[PDB]
Design a protein around this ligand. Sequence first.
Ligand SMILES: [Cu+2]
Ligand SMILES: [Cu+2]
Ligand SMILES: [Cu+2]
Ligand SMILES: [Cu+2]
Ligand SMILES: [Cu+2]
Ligand SMILES: [Cu+2]
Ligand code: NA
Ligand code: NA
Lengths: 439, 439
Amino acid sequence: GPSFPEPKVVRSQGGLLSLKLSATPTPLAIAGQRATLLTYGGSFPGPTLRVRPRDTVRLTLENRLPEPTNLHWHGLPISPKVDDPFLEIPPGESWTYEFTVPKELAGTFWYHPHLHGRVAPQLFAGLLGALVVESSLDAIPELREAEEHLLVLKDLALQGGRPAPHTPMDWMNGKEGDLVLVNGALRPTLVAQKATLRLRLLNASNARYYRLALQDHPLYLIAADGGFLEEPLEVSELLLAPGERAEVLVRLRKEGRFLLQALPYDRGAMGMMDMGGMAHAMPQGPSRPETLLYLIAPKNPKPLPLPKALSPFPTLPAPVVTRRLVLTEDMMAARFFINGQVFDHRRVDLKGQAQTVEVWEVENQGDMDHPFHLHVHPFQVLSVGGRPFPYRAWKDVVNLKAGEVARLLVPLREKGRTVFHCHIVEHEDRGMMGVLEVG
Amino acid sequence: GPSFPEPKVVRSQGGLLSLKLSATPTPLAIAGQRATLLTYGGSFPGPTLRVRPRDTVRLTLENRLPEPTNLHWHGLPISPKVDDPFLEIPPGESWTYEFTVPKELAGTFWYHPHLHGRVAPQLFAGLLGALVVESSLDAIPELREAEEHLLVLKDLALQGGRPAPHTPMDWMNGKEGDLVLVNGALRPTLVAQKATLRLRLLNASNARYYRLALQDHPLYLIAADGGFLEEPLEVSELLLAPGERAEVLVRLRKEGRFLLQALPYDRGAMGMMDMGGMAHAMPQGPSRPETLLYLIAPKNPKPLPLPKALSPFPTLPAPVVTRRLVLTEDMMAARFFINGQVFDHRRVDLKGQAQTVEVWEVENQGDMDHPFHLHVHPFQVLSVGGRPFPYRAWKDVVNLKAGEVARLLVPLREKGRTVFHCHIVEHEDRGMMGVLEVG
Ligand SMILES: [Cu+2]
Ligand SMILES: [Cu+2]
Ligand SMILES: [Cu+2]
Ligand SMILES: [Cu+2]
Ligand SMILES: [Cu+2]
Ligand SMILES: [Cu+2]
Ligand code: NA
Ligand code: NA
């Protein structure tokens, strides 16, 4: 096949993407070994769904797992009556998700399970795939002429030909695996045919962070989780926390082989040691560097000019309320809290008004990084840790290092009950989730 | 002194730059050796004059040379009654140039002799200096915060402690020297203190070309000969022909030492060989590579963002005439022609109307590169060799390789008699110059 593996794409046809997926244990070859994963559509990752604004999506999920499951349409501003975090699809049953893609939308999104208490093992076992919303902006020459690729970053650990089970330490830290894969492949080679690449990046890992850097090159950020930036932003590296997405342009500068690496990054994961007194928790420290893929530049590369503008960011109405959410940890219990409470699906924590704008101040009073995710209502990150954000774009996950406060501008869109939670999904399963009701 | 030598600057004071220069043989230390050069203001290069639009310049040139001389205010759109190519200042006499700097003007210009038949030996011996027109655009943060330097590129050859005399081959080719200097210094070191440099570049050589490339870096072109571009233009290298100027931003990417080089370039200079029959002219081929300076980047360089816009280029009226100028050579005679004629100061070759726009098609039917210069009336280069120019900016010198046609948009500004000529100044002295009268 093509030197660079990418998930099979399913495109809407005549404005309709109508598809039956099964969530099923699946024998696969992965990273040179045979394994049984839990997959959508028989593949790992699941198929990439590619749609346009105003398309209808009709997705029937058949549950062939021994456990209940459901779907979260991560990042899509649709109704929480469709993107329903409380729905359970029992084993053997099916459910049809039907929605219209919003008009003012573009970017890379994804789908994965969201059945509270079961997300981490289901996501770790392989249940995830991408959704791309194509934009009329993709026709501008500086993007149309770029070579486009999707990079699904997800790690895995295997034991006896199956995903390794969660340990107690995994529930505390979030599980990371030793197989650090791109599109399910181990260190694939991307042989570029054009000098400009457009890379859609998705961190679909349970807990692993990717401090992305391409040898000898900057990256040009053109989209965040849920939409384009206003103009490209040059960066030397790009941290992608669990659940985050980005799109970057790469402008290949000369012939040769360049590594795309996940550089060392310390997210605050903890180990245990015994040195006499003890036993006591100790930091794991930074991750070991990983090579994600090999990028081969073409002969005599002449990259296109960057686009000068992308999409203007909407002017938002003045906000009507300020919220404060505080994140705390009980690491030895593997319990995680928002404002001192664990998730309770019967308890509404915040009540807001549709079509108003709110300011959310999310404060990490723990020692681990926590990537904060809000369903249904994309937000604008104003500042994190007291540093203004260098661009305007829609996001739906924001990473908070220990001690940091993120200030978010949250326009409330669709009415209904939805959730916010840590996207280290072990922490969500262990309680770090709350309920927002919009009316 | 400062590790990077630059000419002393003379600034206008209260809107007036009033200065007496003497053109004089001057004992100097240059490139580690003692030499007697012909200088303005006792230095090589002469002092940099720094003015703003609407300033008055009052420059009294005292001629202390044994030959007549004059000044050409290269690139300034002022009256040819001030910038007078036919004026002769006899030995021992003085002349005061007085003009107002035009309102809509910015960039790097320069001054040098323009007494027909004597330019090449006077310019080669050291008579040149820079003029900078400061702009309100210099206050935008992306430029204000850059570290600015002027680089006067000029080569020299010494014989018996004096500039080497012209040979017959020098009159045919244009004289190049073995000492390839920046600001009169041999391979100086520029120890950058900021991560973004703004470099004003001037090729003040008689005939040498500089195919400029900075190791491991692109250059961002922000101004051509006579004004800013509309937006920065990324280039991997930049060819500066005799008389041309440019301004570039350099965005230092990492710590280290980076050479700024004049890469090999074949301008069509000719030698003579005898292999049996003979003797016959043979191409010299490409120049040998030269290191111009050593650039030391600071620690942990974080360059500023590029400006997104510079200055919009004026919309010009539709043109009223098309001209054709053809350049030809008689190399073995060292005679050079425009439309089949050599310069005659009594003969008007073109007659145009002030405030109209003309299209000039300049065609090089020789085998050497010829850099075509027009006094008094800056032009917009539309295309060269059938390739559209990638930016809009005012230029006053355009390089033509063998066979190439340049199409120029020439707004005629000040009334009076002026000249156009090759800026390989040996070729001008040997006849490749014509007269334009604007009325
Ligand atoms: Cu998600
Ligand atoms: Cu967390
Ligand atoms: Cu969720
Ligand atoms: Cu000149
Ligand atoms: Cu010439
Ligand atoms: Cu001239
Ligand atoms: Na299946
Ligand atoms: Na003097």
